[PDB]
């Protein structure tokens, strides 16, 4: 009963960062051998666990969180980071344990005159707590007057597009990010690596 990483890393569509997609992984044998050939594999770093010893441990709760961001925003997806994505779109906890995987997907996501299907949040009243998702598209008030939906002065639409193009240099190109969060503790485990009894 092999673990279906295929539906996570080889998906035909990825979610925008403002509305990141999560699915639960359980009741499977998870070999991490298969996902080392998706790319040059630009980023792969783990917290609390060595990337080399994953095929030796067994986990209680595994979740895969996927989204698309700019290359120079990949650095914000880590514990203790701040900027824009970390604060308004996707926050990780300071005691996060798990692995962050990312690769350059320009050849899939870019378009001749800009891909505008990927959105991120620019404006919010307060910062997000770990693993929160803010979907609301309600108009943001930046002034002392109730603009009541009218995008006038001191009033903004919360979301903006990335507009990805083939001509962009690295850092402005789209990257696909998958975060695998682990729960390694005394609780009964369900997702083990490929070992014999």
């Amino acid at each position: 009963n092999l673990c279906p990483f295929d539906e996570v890393f080889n998906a035909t569509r990825f979610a925008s960062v403002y509305a990141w997609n999560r699915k639960r992984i359980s009741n499977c044998v998870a070999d991490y051998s298969v996902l080392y050939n998706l790319a040059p594999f630009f980023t792969f770093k783990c917290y609390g666990v060595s990337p080399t010893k994953l095929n030796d441990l067994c986990f209680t709760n595994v979740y895969a969180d996927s989204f698309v961001i700019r290359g120079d925003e990949v650095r914000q997806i880590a514990p203790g980071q701040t900027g824009n994505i970390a604060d308004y779109n996707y926050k990780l906890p300071d005691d996060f344990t798990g692995c962050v995987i990312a690769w350059n997907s320009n050849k899939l996501d870019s378009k001749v005159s800009g891909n505008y299907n990927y959105l991120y949040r620019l404006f919010r009243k307060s910062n997000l707590k770990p693993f929160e998702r803010d979907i609301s598209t309600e108009i943001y008030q930046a002034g002392n007057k109730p603009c009541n939906g009218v995008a006038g002065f001191n009033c903004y639409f919360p979301l903006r597009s990335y507009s990805f193009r083939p001509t962009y240099g690295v850092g402005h190109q789209p990257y696909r990010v998958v975060v695998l969060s682990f729960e390694l503790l005394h609780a009964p485990a369900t997702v083990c690596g490929p070992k014999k009894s």
Partner: antibody
Amino acid sequence: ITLKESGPTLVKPTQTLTLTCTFSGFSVTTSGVGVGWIRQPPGKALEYLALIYWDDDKRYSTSLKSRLTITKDTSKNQVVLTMTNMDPVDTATYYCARHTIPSIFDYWGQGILVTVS
Amino acid sequence: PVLTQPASVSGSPGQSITISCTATSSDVGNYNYVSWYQHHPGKAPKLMIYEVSNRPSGVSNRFSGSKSGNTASLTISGLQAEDEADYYCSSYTSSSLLFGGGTKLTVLG
């Protein structure tokens, strides 16, 4: 992977040009894959006209945007390009080709020659 | 935003020739998606090189390419009598894609 082009070979001034591209061997409903049109007037370089993506995004040449329209039908693998207000100078061989990012166009069709008179 | 090419390239059979394609602006950005086509009269254009230096399958190893600065070059080694074609370069710009002027290659013999 094949692409075939059909439509009127003879058009007259101020009329509307229409060309229909039939493709097989692949689907267009995949990420990073579209279909576009290129024309080549006699003795001249290739000119880009229009491009349609798998998600129905549409792109046009910056000088011909006001004249070109492109649509697709994925039930019978058709891509249709129309061009209004045909001028006598708009005589060229038209080509239908597959569009991807790492390689701008490939698997070009044989092309269809259209004369305006 | 015009790709510039030499009108014509000549050479003897068996030697190597170079067909260049130089950018005239910076609208091309990274200019890292340069494609080369071989066009024979009466035939559909064939892709020979893509992404600057990569070959498609079914393409002879006599065809290769590379960049320097903002100029791309197509190298044809072992020039054969069957290589007579109009060669075109293509790349991306800020809001569209462009083709070059076209180079006519003639093989002596």
